[PDB]
Amino acid sequence: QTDDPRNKHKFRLHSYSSPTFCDHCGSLLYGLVHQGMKCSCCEMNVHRRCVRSVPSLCGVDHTERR
């Protein structure tokens, strides 16, 4: 099983105490999702239905222009 292109965000529902804001829709993650989904790779909070909208932009930041 060599094929393993998992370069997406490792979103992981956390359990701090309240839902954080979403960066893909800029909206507080209502109870619809236990808190917010924090990416365990670049730190990105999103909704449970907003990930299917993001083109998996994890580990693909970029390089400064220096």
The reply on whether position 50 binds Zn ion by CB under 5 A is yes
Residue 13 touching Zn ion (CB under 5 A): no
Residue number, 3 or 40, with CB nearest to Zn ion: 40
48 Rama class: left (phi>0) / alpha (psi -120 to 50) / beta: alpha
Q: Is 54 in the site for Zn ion (CB under 5 A)?
A: no
Q: Are 37 and 51 in contact (CB under 8 A)?
A: yes
Contact between 24 and Zn ion by CB under 5 A: the answer reads: yes
Q: How far apart are CA 7 and CA 33, in angstroms?
A: 23
Nearer to Zn ion, 35 or 58 (CB): 58
Tell whether residue 41 is a contact of Zn ion (CB under 5 A).
Answer: yes
